[PDB]
Amino acid sequence: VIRPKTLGQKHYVDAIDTNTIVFGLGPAGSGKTYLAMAKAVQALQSKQVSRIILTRPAVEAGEKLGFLPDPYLRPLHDALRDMVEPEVIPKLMEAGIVEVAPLAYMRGRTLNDAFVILDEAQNTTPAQMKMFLTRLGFGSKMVVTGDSGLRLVRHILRGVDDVHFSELTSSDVVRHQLVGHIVDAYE
Amino acid sequence: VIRPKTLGQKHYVDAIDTNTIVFGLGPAGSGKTYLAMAKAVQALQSKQVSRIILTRPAVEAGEKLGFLPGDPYLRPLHDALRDMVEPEVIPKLMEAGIVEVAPLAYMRGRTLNDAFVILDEAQNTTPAQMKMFLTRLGFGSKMVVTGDGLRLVRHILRGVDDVHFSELTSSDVVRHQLVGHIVDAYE
Amino acid sequence: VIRPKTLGQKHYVDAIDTNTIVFGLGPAGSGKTYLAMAKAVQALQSKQVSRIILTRPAVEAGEKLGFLPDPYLRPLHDALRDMVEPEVIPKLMEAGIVEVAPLAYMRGRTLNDAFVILDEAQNTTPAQMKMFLTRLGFGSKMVVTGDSGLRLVRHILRGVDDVHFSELTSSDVVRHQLVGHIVDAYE
Amino acid sequence: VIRPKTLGQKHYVDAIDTNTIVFGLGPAGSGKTYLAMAKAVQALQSKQVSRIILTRPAVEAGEKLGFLPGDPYLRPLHDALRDMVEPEVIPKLMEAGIVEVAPLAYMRGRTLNDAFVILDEAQNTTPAQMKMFLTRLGFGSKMVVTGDGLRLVRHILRGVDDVHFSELTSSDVVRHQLVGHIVDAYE
Amino acid sequence: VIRPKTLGQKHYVDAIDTNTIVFGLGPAGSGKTYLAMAKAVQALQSKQVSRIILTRPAVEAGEKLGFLPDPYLRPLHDALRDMVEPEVIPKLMEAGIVEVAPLAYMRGRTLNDAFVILDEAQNTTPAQMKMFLTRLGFGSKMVVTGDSGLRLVRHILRGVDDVHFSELTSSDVVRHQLVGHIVDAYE
Amino acid sequence: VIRPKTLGQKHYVDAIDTNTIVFGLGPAGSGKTYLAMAKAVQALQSKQVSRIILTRPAVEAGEKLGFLPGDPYLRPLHDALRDMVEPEVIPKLMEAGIVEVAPLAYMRGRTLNDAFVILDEAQNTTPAQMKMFLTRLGFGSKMVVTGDGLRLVRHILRGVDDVHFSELTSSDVVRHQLVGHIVDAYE
């Protein structure tokens, strides 16, 4: 049911198959996070990896400082429901086969035999990103997705092989058409 | 058991059948919330959707503010499920997230695919909150927004296709006759 | 094992069979609460209703103000033990087939296919009582039991049909005879 | 295993058999509490009653007041059940409420039908609390009040039939001989 | 796998078989606590007792006052692992067949059909010790183990029969030889 | 899957096989902690030991003090088990205490028999803490102390037999090639 529906979505998924680390950069709705998650589940289901780690930084665009350094994690739990049977999800969560966690919980780990997705990566620092990327173990895949910040790594890893940058655009944004019609109505 | 009883009710359920987003506006007891939920449960059972999300804003008419902004208000939504689902199945549906009952704030950042979503007590919302709600619409989903800044949406979306406004009236309020007799005694 | 043992107890139960709402008014020990509960269980066991809701107001006669607006609810849980197998009780409580709760938790509900008992109703206001009585759905029964307050509704609903007032008296108070002998000893 | 050993003990258990309320008064170690409990368990097992309620007041001789008035004091009642019930069955009996171990305050407002009820450490009660306890008596129940304002009840109920006072003495205190020898060593 | 390995260890265990109360006094490593625990488990496994109670006083040598009158109890839980299958342990703990608790939780009990071990008894007062020893029921064994304090009871119960004092010494201390070699290295 | 890859790694695992205590000292990524754990799991599985205890001190290089002295630091030890144990078995091993992951403070007063014990991040320890750790050694156990007051132990125990020091170097650091390339990009 969950397939790429634009050229740029096909290219993106094709990059994930052929590269160990992929950056999916694009606007909300372009499949950058969603399609990565679907490949993660595909990978787990076909035993290419033994676990899936979904992560996000504790900072959110245009939100006020909330804590002293879970709502932000809810969309990650929610999108799993389209890809895994909802009753199996708590089983996976308990065994830690699927892990949904803040970026801070990655520190000092080596992530082997895993599909790791760092989402909303625009909200990261270069130092936090270095920490994430260097968690990479053997037999794993990383997808870093987001919508200076990670313009530094885009530049810094421009020549590195087995890394890929996919730029999705407004043209890759496939929504139910009522969303557009409603948004226009508000404008 | 659960059925449209008035012409207005029949027309409403017919609108839910034929539209992706329906606004059920009427007085307490007109079936605006109840019949939406019965259709949600019907959709789930016949696999038209794989989950039900029931939601209300954290604000109620003529009640004093109760917290630092951002369960008592949600209790009646839980309660009405008991009419439609076998009460022992309910906690396992809640546990698996197949039925979700949650505050509107918990909708932020989501895309609701393959879901029957009901926002209740929508008169207690603002334009901005409504716009956030409606734009959560994913694919294969249904939304029913029910209430008794809503007037503003009535206007904004009045030209939009696959959206429908169903006005229910006092004439659609079907209660046990004793309720009216007791209400009169107190008059 | 739990039968009416005076004329007035028989009449009371006979009112519950033939009326949608019944007020059982009498002193402690007359069966006003106990016998209602037994009919509720009878109703549930024979599938005339699908759930039982037992409720009480947060105010108790001659007790000091305890909270900021569970001990009071304990006798309701306790009397269920005479009527349901104690090991089944937690099962019923979890599925919400049996609900023991304060009166406040009734607000905004419609109680369908239910046997509802508001106990210690002397401790209610006319406004709280109006709220309770207007919760009545279809296929339900209500028994309001207690020992101005509800003298107002006694007056106000004196002419209403399918409502009944049963006055039990000291003559309906059937205790183990040792209770009387001990109470006399204290006097 | 558990048996009356002295004449006084035999007479006591005989009183429990033939009376609805028994007062077992004696020193620690005389079997006043233990043998009541053994009879309670026997009653439950042979279906003479469907539950056991064990209760103590929240007050103890020569102990400083421990809380704002109205588990350590209750631990020995739990402990003695281990002698009479298979230890793994105990939590399921507690969970089903078939065995209840609770403070006297939790008795208020109840009618205890089909129950074997033991109020222990009753010397620590007042007339008013005792009167509240005894008047919880329902039908098909047994009460044993045991202790080492009780003197006042001895007087008040001394004429009452189906109540019995059993005085146990030092002569009924059957302990392991080593306990006495050690108590002497310390003298 | 867990046997006495010195003459003094054999004598100790032989005292436990032939006496109702035994004091095992010796340095860390001599088997005084460990071997008592092993006999307790032996006793439980062969149904000579129906439960095992391990206890320790809330005071520890050369530690600062920690609380207002669990780390201290951890070695007791830990040593059970050598004697019981680790997965069975939580089962035993839940049914209270094995009890690991502070000395305070013994107060007011009678310990029947039990193997009781008070460990680190050097940290006890004569009054606390009197309380412990007088908990003794029928069909039970007590071992008090430790490394004035209990010199008073050593003196006080010197003539009492069915009590025994086993003095283990440095000669009874059997460790892995690397422990000695490492300790010497530090010296 | 998990194997020594460099000469240094082979030699290390060989030392663990032939010695009761091994010190694995090297840089992050040299397999000093990981390969110890893999041998621990292997020991458990082949019944050479009946439990695994993984431990770290509550102190980390260049991190600010985080509490009043005496889970984030422990997370990577939990994580690495996922590589060696079936993730669903992990919580049941934790629940049964067959795998223990704990702070060094939790070692005090124990004798670790029939166990594979790994103290990690041992560079963060003092002489006194190390001495406490090593002297927990029981019979049929293995200890691996791994790190990147340790220098002092290297000296103190350098003559001791059945203890071994394995120095791993940068040459033993086997990572995914992309990690190095990314580390360079950032340089």
mmCIF file with all atom_site columns, N, CA, C and O in Angstrom, chain B residues 14-45:
data_model
loop_
_atom_site.group_PDB
_atom_site.id
_atom_site.type_symbol
_atom_site.label_atom_id
_atom_site.label_alt_id
_atom_site.label_comp_id
_atom_site.label_asym_id
_atom_site.label_entity_id
_atom_site.label_seq_id
_atom_site.pdbx_PDB_ins_code
_atom_site.Cartn_x
_atom_site.Cartn_y
_atom_site.Cartn_z
_atom_site.occupancy
_atom_site.B_iso_or_equiv
_atom_site.pdbx_formal_charge
_atom_site.auth_seq_id
_atom_site.auth_comp_id
_atom_site.auth_asym_id
_atom_site.auth_atom_id
_atom_site.pdbx_PDB_model_num
ATOM 1   N N  . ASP B 1 14 ? -25.873 9.053  5.620  1.00 0.00 ? 14 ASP B N  1
ATOM 2   C CA . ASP B 1 14 ? -25.666 9.122  4.172  1.00 0.00 ? 14 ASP B CA 1
ATOM 3   C C  . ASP B 1 14 ? -24.527 10.077 3.724  1.00 0.00 ? 14 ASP B C  1
ATOM 4   O O  . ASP B 1 14 ? -23.770 9.753  2.842  1.00 0.00 ? 14 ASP B O  1
ATOM 5   N N  . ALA B 1 15 ? -24.372 11.231 4.374  1.00 0.00 ? 15 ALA B N  1
ATOM 6   C CA . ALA B 1 15 ? -23.280 12.149 4.092  1.00 0.00 ? 15 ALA B CA 1
ATOM 7   C C  . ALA B 1 15 ? -21.955 11.550 4.518  1.00 0.00 ? 15 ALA B C  1
ATOM 8   O O  . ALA B 1 15 ? -20.984 11.614 3.780  1.00 0.00 ? 15 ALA B O  1
ATOM 9   N N  . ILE B 1 16 ? -21.892 10.972 5.708  1.00 0.00 ? 16 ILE B N  1
ATOM 10  C CA . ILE B 1 16 ? -20.692 10.267 6.141  1.00 0.00 ? 16 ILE B CA 1
ATOM 11  C C  . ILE B 1 16 ? -20.331 9.185  5.113  1.00 0.00 ? 16 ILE B C  1
ATOM 12  O O  . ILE B 1 16 ? -19.183 9.027  4.754  1.00 0.00 ? 16 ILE B O  1
ATOM 13  N N  . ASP B 1 17 ? -21.305 8.453  4.608  1.00 0.00 ? 17 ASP B N  1
ATOM 14  C CA . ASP B 1 17 ? -20.992 7.432  3.614  1.00 0.00 ? 17 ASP B CA 1
ATOM 15  C C  . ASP B 1 17 ? -20.365 7.982  2.325  1.00 0.00 ? 17 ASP B C  1
ATOM 16  O O  . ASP B 1 17 ? -19.555 7.329  1.710  1.00 0.00 ? 17 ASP B O  1
ATOM 17  N N  . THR B 1 18 ? -20.744 9.176  1.909  1.00 0.00 ? 18 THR B N  1
ATOM 18  C CA . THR B 1 18 ? -20.433 9.608  0.564  1.00 0.00 ? 18 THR B CA 1
ATOM 19  C C  . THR B 1 18 ? -19.393 10.736 0.504  1.00 0.00 ? 18 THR B C  1
ATOM 20  O O  . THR B 1 18 ? -19.036 11.180 -0.583 1.00 0.00 ? 18 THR B O  1
ATOM 21  N N  . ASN B 1 19 ? -18.929 11.189 1.668  1.00 0.00 ? 19 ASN B N  1
ATOM 22  C CA . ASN B 1 19 ? -17.963 12.295 1.786  1.00 0.00 ? 19 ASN B CA 1
ATOM 23  C C  . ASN B 1 19 ? -16.796 11.889 2.674  1.00 0.00 ? 19 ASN B C  1
ATOM 24  O O  . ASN B 1 19 ? -16.943 11.073 3.568  1.00 0.00 ? 19 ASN B O  1
ATOM 25  N N  . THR B 1 20 ? -15.633 12.483 2.408  1.00 0.00 ? 20 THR B N  1
ATOM 26  C CA . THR B 1 20 ? -14.442 12.245 3.179  1.00 0.00 ? 20 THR B CA 1
ATOM 27  C C  . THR B 1 20 ? -14.437 13.046 4.487  1.00 0.00 ? 20 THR B C  1
ATOM 28  O O  . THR B 1 20 ? -13.892 12.535 5.486  1.00 0.00 ? 20 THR B O  1
ATOM 29  N N  . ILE B 1 21 ? -15.014 14.257 4.488  1.00 0.00 ? 21 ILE B N  1
ATOM 30  C CA . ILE B 1 21 ? -15.122 15.048 5.711  1.00 0.00 ? 21 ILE B CA 1
ATOM 31  C C  . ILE B 1 21 ? -16.552 15.525 5.862  1.00 0.00 ? 21 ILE B C  1
ATOM 32  O O  . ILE B 1 21 ? -17.107 16.118 4.945  1.00 0.00 ? 21 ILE B O  1
ATOM 33  N N  . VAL B 1 22 ? -17.134 15.253 7.025  1.00 0.00 ? 22 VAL B N  1
ATOM 34  C CA . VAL B 1 22 ? -18.447 15.699 7.345  1.00 0.00 ? 22 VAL B CA 1
ATOM 35  C C  . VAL B 1 22 ? -18.414 16.499 8.657  1.00 0.00 ? 22 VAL B C  1
ATOM 36  O O  . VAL B 1 22 ? -17.683 16.156 9.607  1.00 0.00 ? 22 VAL B O  1
ATOM 37  N N  . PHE B 1 23 ? -19.197 17.571 8.671  1.00 0.00 ? 23 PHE B N  1
ATOM 38  C CA . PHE B 1 23 ? -19.445 18.396 9.868  1.00 0.00 ? 23 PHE B CA 1
ATOM 39  C C  . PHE B 1 23 ? -20.863 18.095 10.306 1.00 0.00 ? 23 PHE B C  1
ATOM 40  O O  . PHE B 1 23 ? -21.771 18.290 9.551  1.00 0.00 ? 23 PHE B O  1
ATOM 41  N N  . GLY B 1 24 ? -21.003 17.532 11.500 1.00 0.00 ? 24 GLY B N  1
ATOM 42  C CA . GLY B 1 24 ? -22.289 17.217 12.087 1.00 0.00 ? 24 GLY B CA 1
ATOM 43  C C  . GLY B 1 24 ? -22.520 18.236 13.178 1.00 0.00 ? 24 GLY B C  1
ATOM 44  O O  . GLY B 1 24 ? -21.945 18.138 14.264 1.00 0.00 ? 24 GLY B O  1
ATOM 45  N N  . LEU B 1 25 ? -23.371 19.220 12.901 1.00 0.00 ? 25 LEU B N  1
ATOM 46  C CA . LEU B 1 25 ? -23.641 20.262 13.878 1.00 0.00 ? 25 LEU B CA 1
ATOM 47  C C  . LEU B 1 25 ? -25.058 20.158 14.366 1.00 0.00 ? 25 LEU B C  1
ATOM 48  O O  . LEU B 1 25 ? -25.968 20.116 13.592 1.00 0.00 ? 25 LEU B O  1
ATOM 49  N N  . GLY B 1 26 ? -25.251 20.092 15.668 1.00 0.00 ? 26 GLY B N  1
ATOM 50  C CA . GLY B 1 26 ? -26.601 20.092 16.214 1.00 0.00 ? 26 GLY B CA 1
ATOM 51  C C  . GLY B 1 26 ? -26.552 20.147 17.712 1.00 0.00 ? 26 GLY B C  1
ATOM 52  O O  . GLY B 1 26 ? -25.468 20.195 18.285 1.00 0.00 ? 26 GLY B O  1
ATOM 53  N N  . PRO B 1 27 ? -27.727 20.126 18.351 1.00 0.00 ? 27 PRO B N  1
ATOM 54  C CA . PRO B 1 27 ? -27.835 20.146 19.784 1.00 0.00 ? 27 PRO B CA 1
ATOM 55  C C  . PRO B 1 27 ? -27.514 18.791 20.403 1.00 0.00 ? 27 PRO B C  1
ATOM 56  O O  . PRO B 1 27 ? -27.633 17.764 19.736 1.00 0.00 ? 27 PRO B O  1
ATOM 57  N N  . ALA B 1 28 ? -27.137 18.796 21.680 1.00 0.00 ? 28 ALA B N  1
ATOM 58  C CA . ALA B 1 28 ? -27.032 17.554 22.460 1.00 0.00 ? 28 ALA B CA 1
ATOM 59  C C  . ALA B 1 28 ? -28.220 16.654 22.175 1.00 0.00 ? 28 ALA B C  1
ATOM 60  O O  . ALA B 1 28 ? -29.330 17.136 22.188 1.00 0.00 ? 28 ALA B O  1
ATOM 61  N N  . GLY B 1 29 ? -27.992 15.366 21.945 1.00 0.00 ? 29 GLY B N  1
ATOM 62  C CA . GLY B 1 29 ? -29.071 14.382 21.818 1.00 0.00 ? 29 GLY B CA 1
ATOM 63  C C  . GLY B 1 29 ? -29.557 14.159 20.392 1.00 0.00 ? 29 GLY B C  1
ATOM 64  O O  . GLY B 1 29 ? -30.432 13.334 20.162 1.00 0.00 ? 29 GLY B O  1
ATOM 65  N N  . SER B 1 30 ? -28.961 14.855 19.427 1.00 0.00 ? 30 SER B N  1
ATOM 66  C CA . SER B 1 30 ? -29.380 14.791 18.003 1.00 0.00 ? 30 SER B CA 1
ATOM 67  C C  . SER B 1 30 ? -28.670 13.694 17.216 1.00 0.00 ? 30 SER B C  1
ATOM 68  O O  . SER B 1 30 ? -28.959 13.482 16.032 1.00 0.00 ? 30 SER B O  1
ATOM 69  N N  . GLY B 1 31 ? -27.741 13.002 17.892 1.00 0.00 ? 31 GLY B N  1
ATOM 70  C CA . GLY B 1 31 ? -27.010 11.855 17.335 1.00 0.00 ? 31 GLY B CA 1
ATOM 71  C C  . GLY B 1 31 ? -25.792 12.273 16.552 1.00 0.00 ? 31 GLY B C  1
ATOM 72  O O  . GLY B 1 31 ? -25.169 11.455 15.916 1.00 0.00 ? 31 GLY B O  1
ATOM 73  N N  . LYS B 1 32 ? -25.443 13.551 16.616 1.00 0.00 ? 32 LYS B N  1
ATOM 74  C CA . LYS B 1 32 ? -24.343 14.095 15.845 1.00 0.00 ? 32 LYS B CA 1
ATOM 75  C C  . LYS B 1 32 ? -23.019 13.411 16.182 1.00 0.00 ? 32 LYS B C  1
ATOM 76  O O  . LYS B 1 32 ? -22.220 13.114 15.272 1.00 0.00 ? 32 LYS B O  1
ATOM 77  N N  . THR B 1 33 ? -22.792 13.123 17.459 1.00 0.00 ? 33 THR B N  1
ATOM 78  C CA . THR B 1 33 ? -21.540 12.456 17.910 1.00 0.00 ? 33 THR B CA 1
ATOM 79  C C  . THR B 1 33 ? -21.692 10.961 17.964 1.00 0.00 ? 33 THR B C  1
ATOM 80  O O  . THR B 1 33 ? -20.884 10.218 17.454 1.00 0.00 ? 33 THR B O  1
ATOM 81  N N  . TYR B 1 34 ? -22.778 10.528 18.540 1.00 0.00 ? 34 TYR B N  1
ATOM 82  C CA . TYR B 1 34 ? -23.091 9.116  18.641 1.00 0.00 ? 34 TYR B CA 1
ATOM 83  C C  . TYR B 1 34 ? -23.131 8.338  17.315 1.00 0.00 ? 34 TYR B C  1
ATOM 84  O O  . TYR B 1 34 ? -22.683 7.205  17.251 1.00 0.00 ? 34 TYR B O  1
ATOM 85  N N  . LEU B 1 35 ? -23.742 8.933  16.279 1.00 0.00 ? 35 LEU B N  1
ATOM 86  C CA . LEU B 1 35 ? -23.952 8.227  15.015 1.00 0.00 ? 35 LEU B CA 1
ATOM 87  C C  . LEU B 1 35 ? -22.668 8.280  14.217 1.00 0.00 ? 35 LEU B C  1
ATOM 88  O O  . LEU B 1 35 ? -22.393 7.372  13.454 1.00 0.00 ? 35 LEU B O  1
ATOM 89  N N  . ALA B 1 36 ? -21.860 9.311  14.420 1.00 0.00 ? 36 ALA B N  1
ATOM 90  C CA . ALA B 1 36 ? -20.520 9.325  13.832 1.00 0.00 ? 36 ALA B CA 1
ATOM 91  C C  . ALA B 1 36 ? -19.664 8.146  14.367 1.00 0.00 ? 36 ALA B C  1
ATOM 92  O O  . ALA B 1 36 ? -19.046 7.390  13.605 1.00 0.00 ? 36 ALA B O  1
ATOM 93  N N  . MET B 1 37 ? -19.674 7.991  15.688 1.00 0.00 ? 37 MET B N  1
ATOM 94  C CA . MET B 1 37 ? -18.976 6.920  16.330 1.00 0.00 ? 37 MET B CA 1
ATOM 95  C C  . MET B 1 37 ? -19.474 5.549  15.874 1.00 0.00 ? 37 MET B C  1
ATOM 96  O O  . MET B 1 37 ? -18.659 4.662  15.585 1.00 0.00 ? 37 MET B O  1
ATOM 97  N N  . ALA B 1 38 ? -20.791 5.367  15.796 1.00 0.00 ? 38 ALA B N  1
ATOM 98  C CA . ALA B 1 38 ? -21.339 4.097  15.296 1.00 0.00 ? 38 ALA B CA 1
ATOM 99  C C  . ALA B 1 38 ? -20.811 3.803  13.857 1.00 0.00 ? 38 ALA B C  1
ATOM 100 O O  . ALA B 1 38 ? -20.476 2.667  13.512 1.00 0.00 ? 38 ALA B O  1
ATOM 101 N N  . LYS B 1 39 ? -20.686 4.830  13.028 1.00 0.00 ? 39 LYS B N  1
ATOM 102 C CA . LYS B 1 39 ? -20.153 4.613  11.684 1.00 0.00 ? 39 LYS B CA 1
ATOM 103 C C  . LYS B 1 39 ? -18.665 4.323  11.728 1.00 0.00 ? 39 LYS B C  1
ATOM 104 O O  . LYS B 1 39 ? -18.135 3.529  10.931 1.00 0.00 ? 39 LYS B O  1
ATOM 105 N N  . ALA B 1 40 ? -17.972 4.959  12.661 1.00 0.00 ? 40 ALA B N  1
ATOM 106 C CA . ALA B 1 40 ? -16.544 4.680  12.837 1.00 0.00 ? 40 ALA B CA 1
ATOM 107 C C  . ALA B 1 40 ? -16.367 3.207  13.175 1.00 0.00 ? 40 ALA B C  1
ATOM 108 O O  . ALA B 1 40 ? -15.615 2.474  12.504 1.00 0.00 ? 40 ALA B O  1
ATOM 109 N N  . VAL B 1 41 ? -17.101 2.742  14.178 1.00 0.00 ? 41 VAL B N  1
ATOM 110 C CA . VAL B 1 41 ? -16.988 1.354  14.610 1.00 0.00 ? 41 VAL B CA 1
ATOM 111 C C  . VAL B 1 41 ? -17.329 0.406  13.456 1.00 0.00 ? 41 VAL B C  1
ATOM 112 O O  . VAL B 1 41 ? -16.688 -0.616 13.289 1.00 0.00 ? 41 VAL B O  1
ATOM 113 N N  . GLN B 1 42 ? -18.320 0.757  12.665 1.00 0.00 ? 42 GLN B N  1
ATOM 114 C CA . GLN B 1 42 ? -18.758 -0.038 11.509 1.00 0.00 ? 42 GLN B CA 1
ATOM 115 C C  . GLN B 1 42 ? -17.657 -0.126 10.467 1.00 0.00 ? 42 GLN B C  1
ATOM 116 O O  . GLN B 1 42 ? -17.405 -1.193 9.925  1.00 0.00 ? 42 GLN B O  1
ATOM 117 N N  . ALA B 1 43 ? -17.024 1.012  10.189 1.00 0.00 ? 43 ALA B N  1
ATOM 118 C CA . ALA B 1 43 ? -15.871 1.090  9.281  1.00 0.00 ? 43 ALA B CA 1
ATOM 119 C C  . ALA B 1 43 ? -14.729 0.156  9.745  1.00 0.00 ? 43 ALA B C  1
ATOM 120 O O  . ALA B 1 43 ? -14.175 -0.612 8.958  1.00 0.00 ? 43 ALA B O  1
ATOM 121 N N  . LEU B 1 44 ? -14.388 0.229  11.028 1.00 0.00 ? 44 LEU B N  1
ATOM 122 C CA . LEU B 1 44 ? -13.331 -0.602 11.606 1.00 0.00 ? 44 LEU B CA 1
ATOM 123 C C  . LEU B 1 44 ? -13.632 -2.063 11.446 1.00 0.00 ? 44 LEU B C  1
ATOM 124 O O  . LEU B 1 44 ? -12.789 -2.854 11.044 1.00 0.00 ? 44 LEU B O  1
ATOM 125 N N  . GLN B 1 45 ? -14.854 -2.420 11.760 1.00 0.00 ? 45 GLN B N  1
ATOM 126 C CA . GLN B 1 45 ? -15.275 -3.813 11.788 1.00 0.00 ? 45 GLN B CA 1
ATOM 127 C C  . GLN B 1 45 ? -15.278 -4.421 10.399 1.00 0.00 ? 45 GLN B C  1
ATOM 128 O O  . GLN B 1 45 ? -15.001 -5.598 10.245 1.00 0.00 ? 45 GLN B O  1
#
